[PDB]
RNA sequence: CAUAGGAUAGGCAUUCGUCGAAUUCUUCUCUGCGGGAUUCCUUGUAAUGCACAAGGUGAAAUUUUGGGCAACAGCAGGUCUGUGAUGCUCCUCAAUGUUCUGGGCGACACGCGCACUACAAUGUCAGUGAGAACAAGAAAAACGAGUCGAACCUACUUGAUCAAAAGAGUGGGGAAACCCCGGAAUCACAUAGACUCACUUGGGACCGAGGAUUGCAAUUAUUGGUCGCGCAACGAGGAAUGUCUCGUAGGCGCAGCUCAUCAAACUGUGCCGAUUACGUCCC
């Protein structure tokens, strides 16, 4: 009996569930709905110049922009460049020491642009990106689903 | 192999100081012939007194100093 | 009609974890907002749990503990949190409870690991010139 | 109030306290309702050169440091009353700076 | 992939005059032909409708004839212009993408172009020397 | 040498569903040299036997997964 | 924006470092001994410490007048902003910077090296100094250079407290045959007000007090 | 409610004893919720004998530059090791380890003290060299092998626990003792 | 925590001469006297002087100490 | 109660650009002077003494840790390539002065120091999570509007009905105030992800073709990025050899410094975090 209320606590939100379980179900929600606007570049391109080959998951633009949607819930006011530090890599240079590179803000611009067209992100009052009230409804309702194990 | 107890550490021996000269009491089963027998033997490794160790051939004694 | 609240701290290297222990209707211990069933490595969730486990689950019965940690990286934020919790129980029993109920559960912490309560004073030693680190020198070559 | 902030910066640790405590002991006599002198973090300045002017020897170094001491005091007096608090011949090497907050 | 082996599974398939180890995955055996590499073999498996999970020897003859025209003529399949090997091609001017035997052929035609005129980057290949800004005092050792 | 197959033959997949649930301590490297298949198949062949409940998953991580027989 | 407080402590140090070099070259035979400058609104003070205040001042202040406007034209001060003063050292025997410039002139006037250096140490140790040390290095005797040191009294050298108690200055003497360098170290005695010497005792002197 | 820790919330420390009565003080059987503890066991001379024996396996895995500092890995890598040891032996795996440490190192050895005289081995070094020679050898087994490290480590611990000669340590434990018997 | 320098030992005998009556077998009270009877700047030496003073108070309970000049 | 779904706390349920109001605080933060550690206490060594070992006490236990500073003599060590430090001596108007222009310092049969990258599955890849400390940052008696601008670093938007790298707007910051809740990398992950022991999806040397930035100038590629090449050795290294005793070695990155553009360097800083010894005079 793994799913039940613990004591008096009656609901869930983000940071009350697993981070991957939220992102995987949010990625699952986006393609099952179909209203997402996946760009044509996501077939050809690579997530950064620090990655050495293509993301090799056909749902990777769904898993990204669900991770990004979680990364607006935490840190409102985050821009494209603050997200590039979140998804950056340690790049393999050949015979030289490895240095950290921040990810291409291009795909992070498409990721926020898709989530605005859902209505889940608002462009912020003065800073970068803000979660709309529909997004708070979406992020928490989906996070209650993953504790009662309704992953779909 | 008989289990003997270190009752005395007689100082660091050898050239490089890695070997330790001890005085080991043999700790037999008290009805035995070789009970309460004490031997002066060389121990390799970190050894404090009251440290039990196993002995293959107990009839040898090391040359002291 | 009252507020029973206690703030404690823990430090390991640079991780300073401030645990705000207060009385609530339900036990709810969460480190930076993560509810301690969800601290991700099962190894480091077990070091934060033995702040609760060596003393008993009964003593954290209706206590809401909020551990806010900053500094010092992944493993040092577990020893900062598990010390902020274990100090947090005891400073909740320095007030609000008598000395007989404490100082048994203080010594249950001290018998298990000395670093549930005091601190680990070890910091990084500075790099010096002529050395790659605190101690390792440049390579001498002779020929 | 006008909320004038005086910035006491100095290179000497014994001269920055002998100004700030003297400047504060002036601003108690007019009952100004100050917000107390805070100690902003001291900034040390490292120049780590070689010791040798030539090239050889063991490659020895020497780090030089220079600490800047930094204090601010907020006081609600008008702008010619804070010039009464400010005007006194200080020690050499201590800079004071009058700033009006909002 | 929890599926049985087919009867026609070649351990070595031959595509673009190149032997290709059919025991490997389908892009990573398709990079064995020159000119392809990993970053382009995932685009040949994507434009041909080939599942990347399958092994290269299960590719049938109708699937291998579709691969060879994605590699010979990739601009008809909307693989973009920046993705190709030979993009502005001096003495031709047209964007190409060079196949197995053609990479080494026009490499020799480029080293001969820079040696007909006495350009310095062609003089370095005549003497066998390093061509870019390497020092080549302590590290050639050939 | 160590030439392993990269897909199942019909003969060796029948070895997968019969002999492997009788083993104790099934791992994808135990199956890789007993059945002469690559570990990428051996790990895939053992995930199939868990959902049919023929073997048990006794220890799981992202890399290392240890399986055992079910005793009933 | 204005420069940062980190950028202004730099330019205020390079101000004092350049002002110190100019006056060390000018006032060498005036017995120069240091500068303190005090900056405020309406005026920038510069106080010059010397041993010969009739010479660093001119006949009517002529010498300091020229020496004022050399600092004005260089550092781009305006009229009224820059005022200079001369104070004299009260002792002259506790200032290592003055004594080394005199020992520079005792050699350049072709006196004997050892007669000159003991004339310093006799004058320094009669002036209340706890100790003194004069080192003359160079071609003293002939073609090949020597080093001689001449010593009397205490001298603390290994502590970092010797910056508080020991006054030092080194100059060059340009002989006809080469270059001689002279050094003068003077251990400051007393002066709890900080006239010449620290207030606190030496770091190892305990001095148990007597009971009433 | 002090629920007396198992080890990974699975394996109890209740029944541990040592066959070697020479090595009881130096093999520590105190309980832990994980191998990792971050304590200073190296200040005093014999204090690392008070370190729990399951931690000392995790410290022996952190070798060769590809492993220096990866203790959370070695705790994970030992988590799957101890579960495999349960499947090979059908016993408490921690007793299998204490039986492996007790048999893993030679009781006698030979050094030059003055000729090449045979010298007894202290109980502290016999706990060190047993842990050392089992992490070694399991490391060299899995170096270009199909087998994972939690299998090769689990095989060295089992075969040394039985005293079989298939273990790497027991080949060297018997080579050193027969050389020491001939260098008497 | 090793041998006391003669700076510590000569000063500690002078505290026992001038202030024998104000001192007993405790460190933490003898330290507070020596801060008022010794004008030195270091707290490290004043800890060492109060350690060797306490030592030669236990020696004066037994018998005579050489060089003590108690008079 | 996941497609197959384990292990693991529990008077008033919980969560916060929500760019809320209030009204009480110093727990953490900053920091000028100051406490605290002394062999202090204890019971064997030693035998008066100076002290020593083990344990206590404690935040810290023996130079507390880590550095700085270091006498006296001397070396025919290095520096006349640091100085408007210098003596002697050479050159001194087609000058060995000083400036331009173009080369060179970097050239490669080779021999050596020092790093860097690896030889793989305790891994490579592609994801996803948690999450550091030291630090830097713009300008002149110039050119512009005695006051202010622009040079410097940066978030944020844009570019974007479509690759990076860019290119542009718009804010902010004189630096505890903006970057910044400094989203470093090791690591982590029950990721039900690909590879499966191969010179291989290890390794990334070599060089081919677009393109864009720094500069007055890129050829003897300045640097980044894209797709090729990868069939270049390399499978753990002969004789020899270097550094190290605890937050250490090793691994990991990040700043600063050189810097218009360029770190396999050095000076610093944090992160993960051991093996062994606590000995000896064998070399
Ligand atoms: Mg060197
Ligand atoms: Mg005048
Ligand atoms: Mg060889």
mmCIF file of N, CA and C in Angstrom, chain A residues 2-3 6 8 12 27 38 52 59 64 66 80 82 87 89 94 99 101 104 117 149:
data_model
loop_
_atom_site.group_PDB
_atom_site.id
_atom_site.type_symbol
_atom_site.label_atom_id
_atom_site.label_comp_id
_atom_site.label_asym_id
_atom_site.label_seq_id
_atom_site.Cartn_x
_atom_site.Cartn_y
_atom_site.Cartn_z
ATOM 1 N N UNK A 2 1.571 1.478 -1.115
ATOM 2 C CA UNK A 2 2.543 2.564 -1.138
ATOM 3 C C UNK A 2 1.892 3.920 -1.335
ATOM 4 N N UNK A 3 0.763 3.989 -2.030
ATOM 5 C CA UNK A 3 0.077 5.263 -2.169
ATOM 6 C C UNK A 3 -1.019 5.308 -1.113
ATOM 7 N N UNK A 6 -0.151 10.330 4.108
ATOM 8 C CA UNK A 6 0.699 10.225 5.282
ATOM 9 C C UNK A 6 0.130 11.154 6.340
ATOM 10 N N UNK A 8 -1.973 13.602 8.083
ATOM 11 C CA UNK A 8 -2.949 14.629 7.776
ATOM 12 C C UNK A 8 -2.687 15.319 6.453
ATOM 13 N N UNK A 12 -0.333 17.227 -3.043
ATOM 14 C CA UNK A 12 1.047 17.287 -3.492
ATOM 15 C C UNK A 12 1.306 18.553 -4.296
ATOM 16 N N UNK A 27 6.351 15.420 -20.087
ATOM 17 C CA UNK A 27 6.712 15.101 -21.459
ATOM 18 C C UNK A 27 5.696 14.167 -22.084
ATOM 19 N N UNK A 38 6.458 21.488 -31.866
ATOM 20 C CA UNK A 38 7.850 21.046 -31.966
ATOM 21 C C UNK A 38 8.472 21.651 -33.222
ATOM 22 N N UNK A 52 28.344 16.214 -28.097
ATOM 23 C CA UNK A 52 29.124 15.840 -29.267
ATOM 24 C C UNK A 52 28.281 15.126 -30.306
ATOM 25 N N UNK A 59 11.732 11.823 -28.125
ATOM 26 C CA UNK A 59 10.874 12.677 -27.325
ATOM 27 C C UNK A 59 11.674 13.723 -26.569
ATOM 28 N N UNK A 64 12.845 18.010 -22.542
ATOM 29 C CA UNK A 64 13.120 19.439 -22.465
ATOM 30 C C UNK A 64 11.798 20.172 -22.672
ATOM 31 N N UNK A 66 9.682 20.445 -20.556
ATOM 32 C CA UNK A 66 9.030 20.010 -19.338
ATOM 33 C C UNK A 66 9.974 20.167 -18.163
ATOM 34 N N UNK A 80 16.744 32.998 -20.554
ATOM 35 C CA UNK A 80 17.278 31.941 -21.401
ATOM 36 C C UNK A 80 18.686 31.593 -20.954
ATOM 37 N N UNK A 82 20.057 31.942 -17.881
ATOM 38 C CA UNK A 82 20.065 31.213 -16.627
ATOM 39 C C UNK A 82 19.684 29.764 -16.820
ATOM 40 N N UNK A 87 21.452 23.474 -18.108
ATOM 41 C CA UNK A 87 21.573 22.349 -19.018
ATOM 42 C C UNK A 87 22.955 22.256 -19.652
ATOM 43 N N UNK A 89 27.166 21.575 -20.046
ATOM 44 C CA UNK A 89 27.893 20.323 -20.104
ATOM 45 C C UNK A 89 29.348 20.581 -19.730
ATOM 46 N N UNK A 94 39.928 17.859 -27.362
ATOM 47 C CA UNK A 94 40.604 16.617 -27.697
ATOM 48 C C UNK A 94 41.724 16.241 -26.746
ATOM 49 N N UNK A 99 36.519 21.910 -20.395
ATOM 50 C CA UNK A 99 35.945 23.083 -19.767
ATOM 51 C C UNK A 99 34.434 23.030 -19.850
ATOM 52 N N UNK A 101 30.825 24.296 -20.613
ATOM 53 C CA UNK A 101 30.147 25.147 -21.575
ATOM 54 C C UNK A 101 28.674 25.219 -21.199
ATOM 55 N N UNK A 104 23.268 25.810 -25.628
ATOM 56 C CA UNK A 104 22.780 26.780 -26.593
ATOM 57 C C UNK A 104 21.426 27.310 -26.161
ATOM 58 N N UNK A 117 2.896 29.441 -25.809
ATOM 59 C CA UNK A 117 1.759 29.191 -26.685
ATOM 60 C C UNK A 117 0.793 28.182 -26.075
ATOM 61 N N UNK A 149 0.444 7.647 -8.587
ATOM 62 C CA UNK A 149 0.923 6.728 -9.621
ATOM 63 C C UNK A 149 -0.052 6.602 -10.783
#
